Design brief:
Blueprint lengths: L1 H19 L11 E9 L3 E8 L5 E8 H6 L3 H11 L10 E6 L3 E7 L6 H8 L4 H20 L2 E2 L8 E3 L5 E3 L6 E2 L16 H4 L7 H16 L9 H9 L11 H10 L16 H4 L9 H5 L44
Antiparallel strand pairs: 1-2, 2-3, 3-5, 4-5, 6-9, 7-8
Helix pairs in contact: 5-7, 7-9
The chain binds ligand A1JEH.
GO cellular component, one term: centrosome
Membrane topology: Lipid-anchor
Subcellular location: Cytoplasm; Cell membrane; Membrane; Nucleus
């Protein structure tokens, strides 16, 4: 379709201009009031904040520089900020400000109050096939966009997909995203979602995102992921085997699509063949999908999250509230010069 080719050509032109001249230092910490911790990790946190002058709410990701250095995440944190400031697509969370101080890196993005897909999936049990298909179509379009820019996402999972006020997906967490022409080698991601070629320490490409989409669709429709175990080594053994059992309630069309996404041989995996994304878009499981209407956000969503307003945190869970310290002395200045 010529309209698709022209769209992706303009998309790449716009990305490259921002990629080659990244924005920096567009706010500071005392421009915001801290409200609540929404998530915590080994080197960072995400906090709901309110901008003092405008009253707007935002999700502020705070990374501790010294912990990023120790856990060998410098390049990944630079990737994340540089990619986020350059992308633009209806299902990607928008970065509004970024800055750094003596202690931390900060990425201030739109706040999506409906909460993580993970919470809704566990609350409901499983999504019906039409419900799963609505979300999957948004991921297919998002990967078509990212891959055309030579980006690999590398962290698809339900906790990274936020549900907005219209019931549509906002992809968050670009911490593992990378611009790759050809192959890349880093071991990263969540065990249940890793493609076989990552587990086997191969040079890998965008096919790993299409494998992860197969895992996600299976998990949405079944309520649990296809490969699971107490120990990661046991998970990896199941993944590298070409074995997957489907629940009897799965449609024949769903099983066929998943056999082609969860294909252990990356040279035979849907998304990585001569016809690229179109082998997925034209598959029978997507026969009812109006791709243009999804992109234009004209389809009624299967559900709308319950929340009271743009500052409501009821769809997120409770964490110990810790200080945001800013050291009197600068830490790791050289390492983060480009941020
Ligand atoms: N994967 C988690 C961790 O980071 C959070 C980021 N979002 C950004 C937009 O608003 C809500 C919070 C996600 O909940």
């Amino acid at each position: 379709q010529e309209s698709v080719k022209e769209f992706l050509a303009k998309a790449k032109e716009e990305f490259l201009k921002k990629w080659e001249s990244p924005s920096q230092n567009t706010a500071q910490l005392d421009h915001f009031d801290r409200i609540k911790t929404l998530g915590t990790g080994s080197f960072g946190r995400v906090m709901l904040v309110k901008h003092k002058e405008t009253g707007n709410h935002y999700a502020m990701k705070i990374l501790d520089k010294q912990k990023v250095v120790k856990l060998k995440q410098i390049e990944h944190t630079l990737n994340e900020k540089r990619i986020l400031q350059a992308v633009n697509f209806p299902f990607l969370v928008k970065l509004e400000f970024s800055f750094k101080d003596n202690s931390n890196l900060y990425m201030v993005m739109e706040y999506v109050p409906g909460g993580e897909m993970f919470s809704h999936l566990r609350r409901i049990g499983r999504f019906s096939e039409p419900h799963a298909r609505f979300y999957a179509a948004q991921i297919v379009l998002t990967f078509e966009y990212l891959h055309s820019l030579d980006l690999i996402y590398r962290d698809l999972k339900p906790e990274n997909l936020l549900i907005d006020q219209q019931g549509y997906i906002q992809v968050t967490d670009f911490g593992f995203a990378k611009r790759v022409k050809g192959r890349t080698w880093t071991l990263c991601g969540t065990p249940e979602y890793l493609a076989p070629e990552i587990i086997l320490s191969k040079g890998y490409n965008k096919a790993v995102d299409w494998w992860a989409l197969g895992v996600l669709i299976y998990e949405m429709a079944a309520g649990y992921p296809p490969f699971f175990a107490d120990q990661p080594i046991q998970i990896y053994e199941k993944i590298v085997s070409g074995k997957v059992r489907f629940p009897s309630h799965f449609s024949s069309d769903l099983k066929d699509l998943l056999r082609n996404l969860l294909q252990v041989d990356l040279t035979k995996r849907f998304g990585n063949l001569k016809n690229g994304v179109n082998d997925i878009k034209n598959h029978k499981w997507f026969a009812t999908t109006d791709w243009i209407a999804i992109y234009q956000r004209k389809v009624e969503a299967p559900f709308i999250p319950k929340f009271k307003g743009p500052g409501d945190t009821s769809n997120f869970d409770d964490y110990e509230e810790e200080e945001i310290r800013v050291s009197i002395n600068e830490k790791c200045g050289k390492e983060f010069t480009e941020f």
